[PDB]
Design a binder for these strands. Structure first.
Lengths: 741, 51
RNA sequence: CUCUGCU
RNA sequence: AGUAGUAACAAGAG
């Protein structure tokens, strides 16, 4: 009697039990050590798929560049980056013809976005490469460093607050003959200044930082991802904005819509294909990813698509949209941390930075790394490898799906000019293509035509992990369609458990996750009760907030027991204070504070909901009652939760490991910046709720506001003559401090 | 400790299945040291909770 | 002897 | 030793 869970599929169809095929209960495979090997492998692989292209040497950066555009046509089914300019232009032209005015309307919408977009938009996003520090920094921090460097270099055209002005400053910076930056060296703190030549700054402005994608499920081997610099992101935002505007106007483009919007759009489109197909016509659906999609999406083709899309538009708009593909076509990839060398005989470790691989001897490496270094050495320049071809983890997902949907629209009977035709859905590298043809031979001919056309445009379908079946069931971006999308709960299992925001936000998020899974992922009511019980147990263990009546011993047990004895109405206690769990299927949508409000003791209610408690801290409105959640698959998600701000809405300790590094000064600067901003809010309460405006320094605004507030308070009598006198004298002293400096 | 006080059949430990790449005497000494530690804890009146 | 446990 | 797997931990920086 050998039990075999897989045999369950003999009765339950695979899709209906697809959740069993997801091991997401276990830990995801993480990456150990450096990502330099993965970056080198990616660069070599990208240059291998385009080897038959043209080799040139950039005249500005001096690095070799490879152009596969209009290269020899593919002669084999392997991935190939030889995209044809004529074919891509033809695909875009036919997309325009089939969807008249799409490019024009999208261009105008992008025009208004470009007009009304501010520099602060670049603050969104995470782990942005900071060229000034040669490391990844938070997007806001990298933006601030770049702005400060530009100001110190005379690029004082960004104070207008418009992103386009910042882009103008970016170009002016690249055109400068020299640059000055500020770096800290400790040997004692030294605020040294470094001078960068034109070529070095150019190389470090096109540089693309690389790391290893961690916690990635479904892949045995780890892969390297990349994040761009501050200069690139500005133009990338506009490019993406235009591509997303175009995508929203395409029925086959489901990328911009997400979640249940994505599922509904895909369901409607597949239903339309099943409907408009002739009854007598044989219908098939292909499921597949595109092999080496990111490695083959050349940026020159993106430049061609942008130039075609921006036809007849104002020349400045064409420039703003086309700059990003230009820069990416001349991009560079940082290698990363480097490698680690060990000596067993002498029993010692060492880390060799990736910048010194262009000269280190090859005897220190194993065979695989030996050949990767040998192959990538020609492209190494100033610690970075030239990666002109391909798109290393490109952010042009929107543009790439525009190209895919253009090729997908090429399958209309007015374009195929044959009995067979095709349509489907495209999203980044994933696609689900439906072929209708009178007979199986027609289906095969249509499949071959689509595959060959994709090869022409540079899209390489992955024959390895793609398959065709009769229309009705398919898969698309981890969404399994079986005559209708089926719920796959295993995807949302990692979201369960303690989120780790705070006691209140984590209770609210847990109950909201259970409720959302009931609504969307077919979480039954009994299983919902199970999930609630398990989440409460995990929450109590994590937060050491077991019920006071329990004998469990923990460093927080004494206080909870004292509170339990103190309270008269036990039911009113929150779970974070040893109170019982009153949640159920009925009230998963009610915050615990409001759920237990009537049961709370008056004094306990006041203490818990005291607005003057020091635990609660409020940042800008954009970071209130919301959290960032990372699903098993997909990008970061902004989850909003309903929670009453109580003493439990505290902040966890901040990682202090930067205190014993040469770059502590940034932390100090952050502290001071906060010290200033919080005072500005003390003078302008609405600064947090909505961003303030003005050109004057903070000191001028604060002192003027203080003076006027003093006069109004005096007139209303809220302050006496002496208080007004002291306020005025302090303001005059502040003025004198500003003047003297 | 109480659970160990429930079985009265222990005896001098001996290596029956060696660890090919390990140092078996080290494992035997580790077990003996753990037994000694828990015995010292038992006969001791102090209350070490995280021995 | 001090600092750090995602920097 | 062992974890682990294409590169690392088996403390690191002063």
């Amino acid at each position: 009697m050998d039990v075999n869970p897989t045999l369950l599929f003999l009765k339950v169809p695979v899709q209906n039990a697809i959740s069993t095929t997801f091991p997401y209960t276990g830990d995801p495979p993480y990456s150990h050590g450096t990502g330099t090997g993965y970056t080198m492998d990616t660069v070599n692989r990208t240059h291998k798929y385009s080897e038959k292209g043209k080799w040139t040497t950039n005249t500005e950066t001096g690095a070799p560049q490879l152009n596969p555009i209009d290269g020899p046509l593919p002669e084999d089914n392997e991935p190939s980056g030889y995209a044809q300019t004529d074919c891509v232009l033809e695909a875009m032209a036919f997309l325009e013809e089939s969807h008249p005015g799409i490019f024009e309307n999208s261009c105008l919408e992008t025009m208004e976005i470009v007009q009304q977009t501010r520099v602060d938009k670049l603050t969104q996003g995470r782990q942005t490469y900071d060229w000034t520090l040669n490391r990844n920094q938070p997007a806001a921090t990298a933006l601030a460093n770049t702005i400060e460097v530009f100001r110190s270099n005379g690029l004082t055209a960004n104070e207008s607050g418009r992103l386009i002005d910042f882009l103008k400053d970016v170009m002016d910076s690249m055109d400068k003959e020299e640059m000055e930056i500020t770096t800290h060296f400790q040997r004692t703190i030294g605020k040294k200044k470094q001078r960068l030549n034109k070529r070095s700054y150019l190389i470090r402005a096109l540089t693309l930082n690389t790391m290893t994608k961690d916690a990635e499920r479904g892949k045995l081997k780890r892969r390297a991802i990349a994040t761009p610099g501050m200069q690139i992101r500005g133009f990338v935002y506009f490019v993406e904005a235009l591509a997303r505007s175009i995508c929203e106007k395409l029925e086959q483009s489901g990328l911009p819509v997400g979640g249940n919007e994505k599922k509904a759009k895909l369901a409607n489109v597949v239903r339309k294909m099943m409907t408009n197909s002739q009854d007598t016509e044989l219908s098939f659906t292909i499921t597949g990813d595109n092999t080496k999609w990111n490695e083959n999406q050349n940026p020159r083709m993106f430049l061609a698509m942008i130039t075609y899309i921006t036809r007849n538009q104002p020349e400045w708009f064409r420039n703003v949209l086309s700059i990003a593909p230009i820069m990416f076509s001349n991009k560079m990839a940082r290698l990363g941390k480097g490698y680690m060398f060990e000596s067993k005989s002498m029993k010692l470790r060492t880390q060799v930075p990736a910048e010194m691989l262009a000269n280190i001897d090859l005897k220190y490496f194993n065979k695989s790394t030996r050949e990767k270094i040998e192959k990538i050495r020609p492209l190494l320049i100033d610690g970075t490898a030239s990666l002109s071809p391909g798109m290393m983890m490109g952010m042009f997902n929107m543009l790439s799906t525009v190209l895919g949907v253009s090729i997908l629209n090429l399958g209309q009977k007015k374009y195929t000019k044959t009995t067979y035709w095709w349509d489907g859905l495209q999203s980044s590298d994933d696609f689900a293509l439906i072929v209708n043809a009178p007979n199986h031979e027609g289906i095969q001919a249509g499949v071959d035509r689509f595959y060959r056309t994709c090869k022409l445009v540079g899209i390489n379908m992955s024959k390895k992990k793609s398959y065709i079946n009769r229309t009705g069931t398919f898969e698309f971006t981890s969404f399994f369609y079986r005559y209708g999308f089926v719920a796959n709960f295993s995807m949302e299992l990692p979201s369960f458990g303690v989120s780790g925001i705070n006691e209140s936000a984590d209770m609210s998020v847990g109950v909201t996750v259970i409720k959302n899974n009931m609504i969307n992922n077919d979480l039954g009511p009994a299983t919902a009760q199970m999930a609630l019980q398990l989440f409460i147990k995990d929450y109590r263990y994590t937060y050491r907030c077991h019920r006071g009546d329990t004998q469990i011993q923990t460093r927080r047990a004494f206080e909870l027991k004292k509170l339990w004895e103190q309270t008269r109405s036990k039911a009113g206690l929150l779970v974070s204070d040893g109170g019982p769990n009153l949640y159920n299927i009925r009230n998963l949508h009610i915050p615990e504070v409001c759920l237990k409000w009537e049961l709370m003791d008056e004094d306990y209610q006041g203490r818990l909901c005291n607005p003057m408690n020091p635990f609660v801290s409020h940042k800008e409105i954009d970071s209130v009652n919301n959290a960032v959640v990372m699903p098993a698959h997909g990008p970061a998600k902004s989850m909003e939760y309903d929670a009453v701000a109580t003493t439990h809405s505290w902040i966890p300790k901040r990682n202090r490991s930067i205190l014993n590094t040469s770059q502590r000064g940034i932390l100090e600067d952050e502290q001071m910046y906060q010290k200033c901003c919080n005072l500005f809010e003390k003078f302008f309460p609405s600064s947090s709720y909505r961003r303030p405006v003005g050109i004057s320094s903070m000191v001028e605004a604060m002192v003027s506001r203080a003076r006027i507030d003093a006069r109004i308070d005096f007139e209303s009598g809220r302050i006496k003559k002496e208080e007004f006198a002291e306020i005025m004298k302090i303001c005059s002293t502040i003025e004198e401090l500003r003047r003297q400096k | 400790i109480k659970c160990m006080k429930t079985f009265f059949g222990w005896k001098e430990p001996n290596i029956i299945k060696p660890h090919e790449k390990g140092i078996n005497p080290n494992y035997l000494l580790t077990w003996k040291q753990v037994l000694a530690e828990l015995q010292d804890i038992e006969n001791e009146e102090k209350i070490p909770r995280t021995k």
